[PDB]
Design an enzyme around this catalytic site. Structure first.
Site, PDB file in Angstrom:
ATOM      1  N   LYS A  37      -5.100  16.072  87.974  1.00 31.28           N
ATOM      2  CA  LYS A  37      -6.342  16.064  88.747  1.00 31.28           C
ATOM      3  C   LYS A  37      -6.120  16.429  90.213  1.00 31.28           C
ATOM      4  CE  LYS A  37      -7.467  12.432  86.232  1.00 31.28           C
ATOM      5  NZ  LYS A  37      -8.903  12.099  86.029  1.00 31.28           N
ATOM      6  N   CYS A  38      -7.153  16.209  91.008  1.00 34.89           N
ATOM      7  CA  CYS A  38      -7.101  16.470  92.429  1.00 34.89           C
ATOM      8  C   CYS A  38      -7.941  15.442  93.173  1.00 34.89           C
ATOM      9  CB  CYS A  38      -7.623  17.879  92.711  1.00 34.89           C
ATOM     10  SG  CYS A  38      -7.799  18.273  94.469  1.00 34.89           S
ATOM     11  N   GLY A  39      -7.290  14.643  94.005  1.00 33.17           N
ATOM     12  CA  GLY A  39      -7.997  13.657  94.800  1.00 33.17           C
ATOM     13  C   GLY A  39      -8.315  12.384  94.032  1.00 33.17           C
ATOM     14  N   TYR A  40      -8.427  12.485  92.712  1.00 35.17           N
ATOM     15  CA  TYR A  40      -8.767  11.327  91.898  1.00 35.17           C
ATOM     16  C   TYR A  40      -7.534  10.717  91.242  1.00 35.17           C
ATOM     17  CZ  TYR A  40     -10.583   8.444  88.099  1.00 35.17           C
ATOM     18  OH  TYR A  40     -10.814   7.414  87.217  1.00 35.17           O
TER      19      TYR A  40
END
Length: 167
Positions: A37-40
């Site tokens: 994921k990204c950021g999460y």
């Protein structure tokens, strides 16, 4: 049967180059099937980051295996890292080249992990973010933590193994 420890199974660094898993022979290692994921994240990121570095000192690792949601069955989700921009997780760990950590292929090592200890349920086969497995000094998975457990929640099972209480 097959598998005495997780070390019966070749590991692969973030490019699927055979990773030296057995360097965590002697001090427990937490291998996490992590959803890139990204950021999460879900706690497990700061957990793993701090755990690994605080305890690699002894031999502990947080091995991050950043599930390839491209499969579809993956524990983090499925379309997420395909529609959104997501790097292969990557962090301050031995993050590996993402494996199908889930009920379809997992990986001999994780197949070993969930076959040794399935899920938080009566049974389960990986279906979340980071989802750690507390791998012991000799590479024996005796726990698996949910992405939602933090450093503390893992340490309390980890430290007895790092510190080597044995029985």
């Amino acid at each position: 049967g097959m598998g005495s420890s997780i070390f019966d199974f070749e590991v692969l660094d973030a490019d699927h180059k055979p990773y030296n898993l057995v360097q965590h022979k002697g001090s427990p290692l937490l291998i996490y099937n992590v959803a890139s994921k990204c950021g999460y994240t879900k706690g497990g990121y700061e957990t793993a980051t701090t755990l690994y570095n605080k305890y690699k000192s002894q031999g502990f690792t947080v091995l991050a295996f950043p599930s390839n949601q491209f499969g579809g069955q993956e524990p983090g989700n499925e379309e997420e890292i395909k529609e959104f921009v997501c790097t292969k997780f990557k962090a301050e760990f031995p993050i590996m080249a993402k494996i199908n950590v889930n009920g379809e292929n997992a990986h001999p090592l994780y197949e070993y992990m969930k076959k040794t200890k399935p899920g938080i349920l009566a049974t389960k086969a990986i279906k979340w973010n980071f989802t750690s497995f507390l791998i012991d000094r000799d590479g024996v998975p005796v726990e698996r933590f949910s992405p939602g457990a933090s450093v503390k929640d893992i340490e309390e099972k980890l430290i007895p193994l790092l510190g080597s209480a044995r029985l």
